[PDB]
Amino acid sequence: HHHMILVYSTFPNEEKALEIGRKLLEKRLIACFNAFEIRSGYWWKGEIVQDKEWAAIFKTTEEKEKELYEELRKLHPYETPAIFTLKVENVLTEYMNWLRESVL
Amino acid sequence: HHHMILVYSTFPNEEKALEIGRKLLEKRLIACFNAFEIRSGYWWKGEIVQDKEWAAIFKTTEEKEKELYEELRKLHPYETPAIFTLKVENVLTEYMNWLRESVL
Amino acid sequence: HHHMILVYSTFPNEEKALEIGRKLLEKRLIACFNAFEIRSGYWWKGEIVQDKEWAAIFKTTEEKEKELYEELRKLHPYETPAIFTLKVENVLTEYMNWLRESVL
């Protein structure tokens, strides 16, 4: 009975990404984050902009999804941040056990 | 009623990845891209090769999926590019609203 | 009839990530890997730690999933590695054909 989720967001810089990751570990809402640098593009005020951001995947259980969204929402510098959940199909047994323990 | 998708592809270099991202924003087929550098490996002509590429995730709505595949297909330098769609489970409400508006 | 999967893991460094990718191509258990550098955070022995790792996505068919997990399990330096599978929804036809051929 795997119950893992993967939530993705982006952040304006490395420091903010890692700061939020750490706060989310402190609040036991995720078991792990993986962050990396990205280049981004989107419309902003009628122009296509290029930006430099940090992305993060947050690994946690379904049970924590609500609390995680609401905490990321409160911590997020962006007025409308990208926060979304990918579907996980299977997970190594030992790893799922460790995930669950890490967010209890 | 979330209707977001995530499409992934890889590109031979940073410039091509960003160039295509921008063209896809211009054609309103995606709301956002996030690109990053990757190392890759695969079989090519009977050998295992290591390569250096740029990956991109393209965020858009289901409604745009067909047009997006066909546009990436036409723009893609690779004869057989990796283009595939990940399933998104949930999405922050404000963000889904902005996604939809960005591709209208 | 797409039958592609995406399996994710993390590794202590670039060399190990690429070494395992290559061994997995040699054993024909994946068609392709894409690896990239990440910063990570998790609990370890009662503290929140920051780490520097390499992530990899491994692209393959459903048919190879079992063999892939068991091979990554045997090769993985971590005692409890993150190994999990994302659900793929659609895939470019030509690309799915190449995936299948690459792991036969």
Short mmCIF file of C-alpha atoms in Angstrom, two decimals:
data_model
loop_
_atom_site.label_atom_id
_atom_site.label_comp_id
_atom_site.label_asym_id
_atom_site.label_seq_id
_atom_site.Cartn_x
_atom_site.Cartn_y
_atom_site.Cartn_z
CA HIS A 1 0.00 0.00 0.00
CA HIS A 2 2.17 2.79 -1.30
CA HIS A 3 0.86 6.26 -0.43
CA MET A 4 3.62 8.55 -1.67
CA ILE A 5 3.20 11.79 -3.49
CA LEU A 6 5.44 14.17 -5.33
CA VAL A 7 4.68 17.90 -5.14
CA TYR A 8 6.55 20.40 -7.42
CA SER A 9 7.10 24.12 -7.01
CA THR A 10 9.51 26.82 -8.17
CA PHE A 11 11.29 29.56 -6.18
CA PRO A 12 13.09 32.80 -7.07
CA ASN A 13 16.49 31.59 -5.90
CA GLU A 14 18.50 28.79 -4.27
CA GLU A 15 18.40 30.20 -0.79
CA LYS A 16 14.61 30.50 -0.67
CA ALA A 17 14.15 27.03 -2.09
CA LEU A 18 16.41 25.48 0.55
CA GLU A 19 14.99 27.64 3.33
CA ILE A 20 11.46 26.42 2.56
CA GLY A 21 12.61 22.81 2.15
CA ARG A 22 14.19 22.98 5.62
CA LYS A 23 11.07 24.59 7.19
CA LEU A 24 8.95 21.84 5.63
CA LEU A 25 11.25 19.17 7.10
CA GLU A 26 11.03 20.98 10.46
CA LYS A 27 7.24 20.87 10.34
CA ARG A 28 7.41 17.16 9.27
CA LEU A 29 5.31 17.78 6.20
CA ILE A 30 7.80 16.18 3.76
CA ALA A 31 10.38 13.42 4.10
CA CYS A 32 12.79 14.77 1.52
CA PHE A 33 13.26 17.53 -1.05
CA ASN A 34 15.35 17.60 -4.19
CA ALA A 35 16.01 21.09 -5.65
CA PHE A 36 17.80 22.18 -8.83
CA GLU A 37 18.39 25.24 -10.90
CA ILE A 38 16.13 25.97 -13.85
CA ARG A 39 15.54 28.50 -16.54
CA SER A 40 11.96 29.45 -17.00
CA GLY A 41 9.76 31.35 -19.40
CA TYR A 42 6.17 32.67 -19.13
CA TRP A 43 4.01 35.65 -19.88
CA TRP A 44 4.23 38.52 -17.47
CA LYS A 45 2.38 41.80 -17.97
CA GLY A 46 2.03 41.29 -21.74
CA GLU A 47 5.56 40.13 -22.48
CA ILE A 48 7.31 36.79 -22.67
CA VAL A 49 9.95 36.83 -19.94
CA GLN A 50 12.94 34.60 -19.24
CA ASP A 51 13.72 33.99 -15.62
CA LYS A 52 16.17 32.04 -13.51
CA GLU A 53 14.58 29.99 -10.71
CA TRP A 54 15.08 26.96 -8.46
CA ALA A 55 12.66 24.05 -8.79
CA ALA A 56 11.96 21.57 -5.95
CA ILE A 57 10.29 18.22 -5.71
CA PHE A 58 8.95 17.44 -2.28
CA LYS A 59 8.40 13.79 -1.40
CA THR A 60 5.71 12.97 1.14
CA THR A 61 2.58 10.96 1.87
CA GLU A 62 -0.96 11.64 0.66
CA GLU A 63 -1.95 12.30 4.25
CA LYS A 64 0.31 15.36 4.34
CA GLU A 65 -0.79 16.83 1.00
CA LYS A 66 -3.28 19.36 2.38
CA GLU A 67 -0.99 20.64 5.14
CA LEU A 68 1.88 20.82 2.64
CA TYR A 69 -0.07 22.92 0.10
CA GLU A 70 -1.30 25.26 2.83
CA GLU A 71 2.24 25.64 4.30
CA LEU A 72 3.89 26.19 0.90
CA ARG A 73 1.11 28.69 0.19
CA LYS A 74 1.95 30.65 3.31
CA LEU A 75 5.72 30.56 2.85
CA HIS A 76 5.83 31.18 -0.88
CA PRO A 77 7.18 34.57 -2.04
CA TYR A 78 5.19 34.39 -5.29
CA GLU A 79 1.66 35.68 -5.26
CA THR A 80 0.56 32.74 -7.47
CA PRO A 81 3.15 30.00 -7.17
CA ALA A 82 3.26 26.83 -9.22
CA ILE A 83 2.30 24.05 -6.78
CA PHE A 84 1.10 20.75 -8.23
CA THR A 85 1.21 17.02 -7.45
CA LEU A 86 2.51 14.20 -9.72
CA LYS A 87 1.07 10.72 -9.48
CA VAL A 88 3.44 8.04 -8.19
CA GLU A 89 2.66 4.49 -9.35
CA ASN A 90 5.06 2.28 -7.35
CA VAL A 91 7.75 2.76 -4.75
CA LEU A 92 10.53 0.57 -3.36
CA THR A 93 9.18 -1.02 -0.17
CA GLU A 94 12.05 -0.07 2.17
CA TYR A 95 11.88 3.50 0.86
CA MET A 96 8.10 3.86 1.35
CA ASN A 97 8.61 2.66 4.95
CA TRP A 98 11.25 5.31 5.53
CA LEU A 99 8.98 7.99 3.93
CA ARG A 100 6.18 7.16 6.28
CA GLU A 101 8.43 7.19 9.35
CA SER A 102 9.99 10.54 8.31
CA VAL A 103 6.66 12.41 8.37
CA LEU A 104 5.03 10.76 11.40
CA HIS B 1 -11.72 20.72 -12.20
CA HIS B 2 -8.00 20.75 -12.73
CA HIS B 3 -6.97 20.09 -16.35
CA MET B 4 -3.22 20.62 -16.28
CA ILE B 5 -0.62 18.54 -17.99
CA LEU B 6 3.11 18.27 -17.92
CA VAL B 7 4.94 17.41 -21.15
CA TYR B 8 8.71 16.56 -21.09
CA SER B 9 11.27 16.71 -23.88
CA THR B 10 15.04 17.02 -24.31
CA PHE B 11 17.08 19.29 -26.62
CA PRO B 12 20.69 19.33 -27.85
CA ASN B 13 21.58 22.56 -26.07
CA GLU B 14 20.36 25.47 -23.92
CA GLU B 15 19.71 27.83 -26.77
CA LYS B 16 17.45 25.44 -28.67
CA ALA B 17 15.53 24.55 -25.54
CA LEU B 18 14.85 28.20 -24.72
CA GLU B 19 14.14 29.09 -28.34
CA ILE B 20 11.45 26.41 -28.54
CA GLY B 21 10.03 27.34 -25.13
CA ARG B 22 9.66 30.94 -26.32
CA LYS B 23 8.04 29.90 -29.64
CA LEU B 24 5.60 27.74 -27.69
CA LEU B 25 4.72 30.69 -25.43
CA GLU B 26 4.30 32.83 -28.57
CA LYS B 27 1.87 30.32 -30.04
CA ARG B 28 0.05 30.13 -26.64
CA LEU B 29 0.42 26.38 -26.46
CA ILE B 30 2.02 26.36 -22.98
CA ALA B 31 1.75 28.65 -19.96
CA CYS B 32 5.25 28.08 -18.67
CA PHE B 33 8.43 26.06 -19.26
CA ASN B 34 11.14 25.04 -16.86
CA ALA B 35 14.42 23.88 -18.48
CA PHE B 36 17.62 22.48 -16.96
CA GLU B 37 20.85 20.89 -17.98
CA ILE B 38 21.14 17.11 -18.02
CA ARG B 39 23.53 14.36 -18.83
CA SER B 40 22.06 11.58 -20.83
CA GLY B 41 22.91 8.09 -22.00
CA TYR B 42 21.35 5.81 -24.66
CA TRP B 43 22.21 3.44 -27.45
CA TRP B 44 23.16 5.01 -30.73
CA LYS B 45 24.30 3.00 -33.73
CA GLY B 46 25.36 0.00 -31.61
CA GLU B 47 27.18 1.87 -28.87
CA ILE B 48 26.23 3.31 -25.52
CA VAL B 49 26.77 7.07 -25.78
CA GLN B 50 26.94 9.81 -23.18
CA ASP B 51 25.50 13.13 -24.21
CA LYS B 52 24.91 16.56 -22.74
CA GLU B 53 21.39 17.93 -23.27
CA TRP B 54 18.80 20.36 -21.90
CA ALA B 55 15.53 18.95 -20.57
CA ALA B 56 12.28 20.98 -20.42
CA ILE B 57 8.96 20.55 -18.72
CA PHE B 58 6.14 22.38 -20.42
CA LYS B 59 3.08 23.18 -18.34
CA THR B 60 -0.25 23.48 -20.13
CA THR B 61 -3.84 22.29 -20.31
CA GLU B 62 -5.14 19.01 -21.72
CA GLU B 63 -6.89 20.99 -24.44
CA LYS B 64 -3.52 22.09 -25.83
CA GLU B 65 -1.85 18.67 -25.73
CA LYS B 66 -2.40 17.75 -29.39
CA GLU B 67 -1.29 21.14 -30.77
CA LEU B 68 1.71 21.07 -28.43
CA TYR B 69 2.91 17.62 -29.57
CA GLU B 70 2.46 18.56 -33.23
CA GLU B 71 4.33 21.90 -32.75
CA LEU B 72 7.18 20.32 -30.76
CA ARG B 73 7.32 17.65 -33.47
CA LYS B 74 7.79 20.28 -36.15
CA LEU B 75 10.32 22.37 -34.25
CA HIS B 76 12.38 19.54 -32.80
CA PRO B 77 15.91 19.08 -34.21
CA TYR B 78 15.92 15.37 -33.30
CA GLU B 79 14.49 12.95 -35.79
CA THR B 80 12.84 10.98 -32.93
CA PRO B 81 12.60 13.25 -29.92
CA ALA B 82 11.51 12.20 -26.45
CA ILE B 83 8.08 13.80 -25.98
CA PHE B 84 5.81 12.39 -23.27
CA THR B 85 3.16 13.56 -20.81
CA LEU B 86 3.14 13.07 -16.99
CA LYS B 87 -0.11 12.80 -15.10
CA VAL B 88 -0.87 15.66 -12.71
CA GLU B 89 -3.15 14.78 -9.78
CA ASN B 90 -3.90 18.13 -8.10
CA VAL B 91 -2.99 21.75 -8.61
CA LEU B 92 -3.22 24.89 -6.47
CA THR B 93 -6.46 26.64 -7.44
CA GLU B 94 -5.02 30.11 -8.11
CA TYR B 95 -2.28 28.54 -10.22
CA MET B 96 -4.66 26.43 -12.35
CA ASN B 97 -6.65 29.62 -13.02
CA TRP B 98 -3.51 31.40 -14.19
CA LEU B 99 -2.55 28.37 -16.38
CA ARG B 100 -5.87 28.45 -18.12
CA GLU B 101 -5.74 32.21 -18.72
CA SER B 102 -2.14 31.97 -20.06
CA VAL B 103 -3.09 29.62 -22.92
CA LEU B 104 -6.48 31.08 -23.88
CA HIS C 1 -0.67 1.16 -26.72
CA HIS C 2 1.94 3.15 -24.90
CA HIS C 3 3.72 1.18 -22.15
CA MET C 4 6.41 3.57 -20.99
CA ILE C 5 7.46 4.23 -17.46
CA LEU C 6 9.64 6.73 -15.70
CA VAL C 7 11.63 5.59 -12.66
CA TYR C 8 13.46 8.17 -10.44
CA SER C 9 16.38 7.70 -8.07
CA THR C 10 19.16 9.75 -6.49
CA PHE C 11 22.90 9.02 -6.18
CA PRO C 12 25.75 10.41 -4.06
CA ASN C 13 27.63 11.87 -7.01
CA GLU C 14 27.80 12.31 -10.80
CA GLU C 15 30.13 9.43 -11.43
CA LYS C 16 27.96 6.87 -9.64
CA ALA C 17 24.83 8.12 -11.35
CA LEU C 18 26.40 7.79 -14.80
CA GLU C 19 28.06 4.49 -13.96
CA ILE C 20 24.71 2.97 -12.99
CA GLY C 21 22.94 4.50 -16.00
CA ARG C 22 25.53 2.88 -18.28
CA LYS C 23 25.25 -0.53 -16.52
CA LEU C 24 21.47 -0.33 -16.90
CA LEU C 25 21.84 0.40 -20.63
CA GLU C 26 24.29 -2.52 -20.86
CA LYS C 27 21.76 -4.85 -19.26
CA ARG C 28 19.02 -3.43 -21.59
CA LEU C 29 16.78 -2.55 -18.69
CA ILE C 30 16.30 1.11 -19.74
CA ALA C 31 16.31 2.89 -23.09
CA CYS C 32 17.62 6.20 -21.81
CA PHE C 33 18.60 8.07 -18.65
CA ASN C 34 18.64 11.76 -17.92
CA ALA C 35 20.68 12.81 -14.84
CA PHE C 36 21.17 16.21 -13.19
CA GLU C 37 22.64 17.73 -10.11
CA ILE C 38 20.41 18.40 -7.11
CA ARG C 39 20.52 19.71 -3.61
CA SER C 40 18.65 17.63 -1.14
CA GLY C 41 17.45 17.77 2.44
CA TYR C 42 16.13 15.08 4.82
CA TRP C 43 16.35 13.85 8.37
CA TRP C 44 19.36 11.78 9.23
CA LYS C 45 20.08 10.53 12.74
CA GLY C 46 17.93 13.22 14.39
CA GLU C 47 19.12 16.19 12.38
CA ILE C 48 18.00 17.91 9.22
CA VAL C 49 20.87 17.55 6.74
CA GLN C 50 21.63 19.24 3.45
CA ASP C 51 23.28 17.09 0.84
CA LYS C 52 24.48 17.34 -2.73
CA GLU C 53 23.35 14.50 -4.99
CA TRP C 54 22.67 13.53 -8.62
CA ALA C 55 19.12 12.62 -9.61
CA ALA C 56 18.29 10.37 -12.60
CA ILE C 57 15.17 9.57 -14.53
CA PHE C 58 15.27 6.23 -16.26
CA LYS C 59 12.95 5.72 -19.21
CA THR C 60 11.79 2.18 -19.96
CA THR C 61 8.81 -0.10 -20.50
CA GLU C 62 6.48 -1.55 -17.87
CA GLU C 63 7.80 -4.99 -18.75
CA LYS C 64 11.25 -4.02 -17.44
CA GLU C 65 10.07 -2.40 -14.20
CA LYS C 66 10.70 -5.39 -11.92
CA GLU C 67 14.16 -6.18 -13.32
CA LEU C 68 15.03 -2.48 -13.15
CA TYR C 69 14.07 -2.10 -9.47
CA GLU C 70 15.95 -5.27 -8.55
CA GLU C 71 19.08 -4.16 -10.51
CA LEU C 72 19.03 -0.61 -9.10
CA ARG C 73 18.56 -2.20 -5.67
CA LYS C 74 21.69 -4.28 -6.11
CA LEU C 75 23.84 -1.50 -7.56
CA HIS C 76 22.72 1.30 -5.28
CA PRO C 77 25.26 2.57 -2.72
CA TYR C 78 22.50 3.77 -0.38
CA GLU C 79 21.10 1.31 2.08
CA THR C 80 17.56 2.67 1.44
CA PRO C 81 17.58 4.48 -1.88
CA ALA C 82 14.74 6.53 -3.28
CA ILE C 83 13.38 4.46 -6.19
CA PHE C 84 9.87 5.23 -7.44
CA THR C 85 7.87 5.22 -10.68
CA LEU C 86 5.92 8.15 -12.24
CA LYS C 87 2.87 7.53 -14.36
CA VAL C 88 3.20 8.44 -18.03
CA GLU C 89 -0.07 9.31 -19.80
CA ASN C 90 0.89 9.64 -23.48
CA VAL C 91 4.01 9.34 -25.58
CA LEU C 92 4.97 10.38 -29.11
CA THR C 93 4.45 7.32 -31.33
CA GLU C 94 7.88 7.27 -33.00
CA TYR C 95 9.51 7.66 -29.59
CA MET C 96 7.54 4.81 -27.95
CA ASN C 97 8.62 2.59 -30.87
CA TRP C 98 12.26 3.48 -30.29
CA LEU C 99 11.86 2.87 -26.50
CA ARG C 100 10.54 -0.59 -27.10
CA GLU C 101 13.29 -1.47 -29.58
CA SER C 102 16.00 -0.14 -27.20
CA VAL C 103 15.11 -2.58 -24.40
CA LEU C 104 14.30 -5.68 -26.46
#
